[PDB]
Amino acid sequence: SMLQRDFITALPARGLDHIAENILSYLDAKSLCAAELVCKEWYRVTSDGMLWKKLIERMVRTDSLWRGLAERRGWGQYLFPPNSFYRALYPKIIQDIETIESNWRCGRHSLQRIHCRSETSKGVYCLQYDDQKIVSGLRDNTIKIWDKNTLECKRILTGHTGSVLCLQYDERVIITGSSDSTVRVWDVNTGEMLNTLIHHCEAVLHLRFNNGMMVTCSKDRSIAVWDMASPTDITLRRVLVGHRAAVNVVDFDDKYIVSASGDRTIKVWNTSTCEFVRTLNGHKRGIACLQYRDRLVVSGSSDNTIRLWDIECGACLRVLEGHEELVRCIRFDNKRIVSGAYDGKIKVWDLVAALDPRAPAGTLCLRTLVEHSGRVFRLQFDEFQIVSSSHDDTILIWDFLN
């Protein structure tokens, strides 16, 4: 048993280059650069092994930011060109990510404004977008589907007798709740109204569906859990009561169903059994928006504050103060929180700093963006851009990539 061994040299010498390459593929960028400088044979293993191309491919496969950069910048077409190309491309990607982070931190961005040109009652309550389209629910009882690129109105869906308050679409259908107390299911491609659910006695304020089941919540102080075998075969599974005011937002996953209502309480129910689990108290006024994922619950309330809780112990992990008005909509990703207020302002907060109990409160709000003249009703964002719609009948696209 030898005391020392040169794996990266011994393995290729024994026809096992793939094992040495699989070893080196676990390294990071700095460690891979150091391995390039160990000896000539290690450099040869990295070069003939395309370790930089493999590192970029793993970054794309594991990071959504690298995915988006590969899809947008164009260098993703070379993945799946010599090794020096990827070796020189990596630091450019790092610098691009640094510039994007600086743009998010300093408010540097470009803006696209879509005037919905609503005929009568102006306003856009809800939206959801992708790389191709932007589906929005307006106060004129219509659903406007715009092109993500040309910004032109591609489709208009009519059917609701009230304001389309909430929507969600996937690769198959769109599902909308409105002031008419109905839940309408439309085709995402042609726009035909496939189904209507009559259950709630008042306005359906929010809905969510994934993996075959849906949850809706209404002004009638109730939640409804539906099993969806097909877009036309939607069966009501359960009805959840307990809230003492209108349920304004509902979200769920495999574990729990999270609801927020004007009764100043968040309620956590069991997803499988539809059983009440716990009540999160803390907000001094009602809660107008909420997003739940993993263990983190983020909620914006009428007390002009944002609250971050753990879903399992019910503790409030962080209180964010800063909005001068009601926090009407809120969303987060793996890095930052984006919230919109009734005063038209949008605030971008550092999620990692907020979850760190050692960061001061004053440093938590990173940026304040002001381009809306009315109440910000809904927003959705990602690594590069924010998409928001407001009472001013406009839809804004804030692009921080440049």
Binding site: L205, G262, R328, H391
Partner: peptide, 9 residues
């Protein structure tokens, strides 16, 4: 004084 999307009490 509230939009049709949310309500209180």
């Amino acid at each position: 004084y509230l939009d049709s999307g949310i309500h209180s009490g």
